[PDB]
Amino acid sequence: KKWFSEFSIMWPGQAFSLKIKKILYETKSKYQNVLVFESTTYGKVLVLDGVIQLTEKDEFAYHEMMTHVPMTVSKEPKNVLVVGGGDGGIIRELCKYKSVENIDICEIDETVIEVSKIYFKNISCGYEDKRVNVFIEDASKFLENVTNTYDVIIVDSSDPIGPAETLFNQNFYEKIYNALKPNGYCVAQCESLWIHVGTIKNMIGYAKKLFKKVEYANISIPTYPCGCIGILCCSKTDTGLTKPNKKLESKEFADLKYYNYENHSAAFKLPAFLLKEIENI
């Protein structure tokens, strides 16, 4: 049996590896190299440009925290945009909210959607929901053109090397600000606090040029580098995203495996050295 190894200039000097049970699919899409394989202990794995995007064993941690942190703070969210997120995990969590009326998703690479529909059926099931509308487009351009404003925007991007290079700059967060309702919220995948704090500092600085409240949360997930990933949290209100406004008690949420009301707030309690680094931003 061979091993898959995640090497990157984005985290030099370290690598995480998963034993391969079977390779399922590979292709070079218009935008990126796509790899799908069944691992021996983490289930099926999606890889883009050599970087693990998700595994069946732990993806719920990332998709639940990214979705339910902002969706329990927004009081009656009606229109939600997912940027990236071609696998559908965020959509799956969003569909649980009966009050949502529309879910737009802007994914640049249609191959990712199609592969997830074929090989990750318990992750992409939300595409069957009639409220979901798919746009195959660079979100940098979608956000410049969209006429609607959203209650919540969830930025579920790949990393800054590749097509997502357009999603990590000041102009991008200005487009996000303008596409939000006056009381709207944005969360975005953000650098692991064990790697490039300098990047976290850059993103926070960008968001603070526009948003009244900018908070950073941490998620434990073993198959992202250093075992965790941040949530950049942007609010137009000064109350922010640290405290939920509802409990997830209906039957649609009985299956949750990571998120709960107490974890929501706990995710924002950061290690001392990081607090120190972002203090004067």
Ligand X SMILES: CSC[C@H]1O[C@@H](n2cnc3c(N)ncnc32)[C@H](O)[C@@H]1O
Ligand Y SMILES: NCCCN[C@H]1CC[C@H](NCCCN)CC1
> Shortest gap between Cβ of 82 and ligand Y (angstroms)?
9
Q: Which is nearer to ligand Y, 62 or 97 (CB)?
A: 62
According to DSSP, the β-strands at 102-107 and 132-136 are parallel
**How far, in Å, CA of 139 to CA of 266, rounded?**
31
CB under 5 to 8 A by kind: which of its own copies, ligand X, ligand Y, none does 51 bind? Answer: ligand Y
Q: Is 229 one of the binding residues for ligand Y (CB under 6 A)?
A: yes
The listed partner (ligand X, ligand Y, its own copies, none) that binds 166, CB under 5 to 8 Å by sort, is ligand X
Q: CB under 5 to 8 A by kind: which of ligand X, its own copies, ligand Y, none does 120 bind?
A: none
190: phi then psi, degrees, rounded to nearest 5: -140, 160
Rounded CA-CA distance 231/212 in Å is: 17
Residue 168: CB atoms within 10 Å: 20
**According to CB under 6 A, which residues from 130 to 159 bind ligand X?**
138-140, 156-158
Nearer to ligand Y, 250 or 271 (CB): 271
Query: Exactly one of 58, 104, 109, 156 is catalytic; which is it?
Result: 156
Q: Which region among 72-80, 104-112, 155-163, 267-275 touches ligand Y (by CB under 6 A)?
A: 155-163
Q: Which residue has the tokens 């930025």?
A: 155
Cβ-Cβ contacts under 8 Å for 7 (sequence gap 6 or more): 15, 50
Phi, psi (degrees; rounded to nearest 5) at 66: -65, -35
Q: Does 87 bind ligand X (CB under 6 A)?
A: yes
- Answer for the pair 274, 190: CB distance below 8 angstroms, yes or no: no
Question: How many of the other CB atoms lie within 10 Å of CB of 162?
Answer: 17
Closest by CA to 115, choosing from 31, 176, 196, is 31
Does position 55 bind ligand X by CB under 6 A? no
Coil/strand/helix, residue 196 = coil
Q: Give CA–CA dist 251/140, Å, rounded.
A: 36
Say whether residue 70 binds ligand X (CB under 6 A). no
* 156 is a contact residue toward ligand Y (CB under 6 A): yes
Q: How many CA atoms lie within 13 A of 275 on its CB side?
A: 5
- Is 156 marked active-site? yes
By CB under 8 A, name the binding residues for its own copies: 3, 5, 12-19, 39-42, 58, 61, 192, 194, 218, 220-222, 225-228, 256-260, 262-263, 265-266, 269-273, 275
Any binding-site annotation on 129? no
Q: Using CB distances below 5 to 8 A depending on partner kind, what does residue 229 bind out of ligand Y, its own copies, ligand X, none?
A: ligand Y
Q: Which residues bind ligand X (CB under 6 A)?
A: 48, 53, 83-87, 106-109, 112, 138-140, 156-158, 163-164, 166-167
Catalytic residues: 156
Residues contributing to the annotated binding site:
156
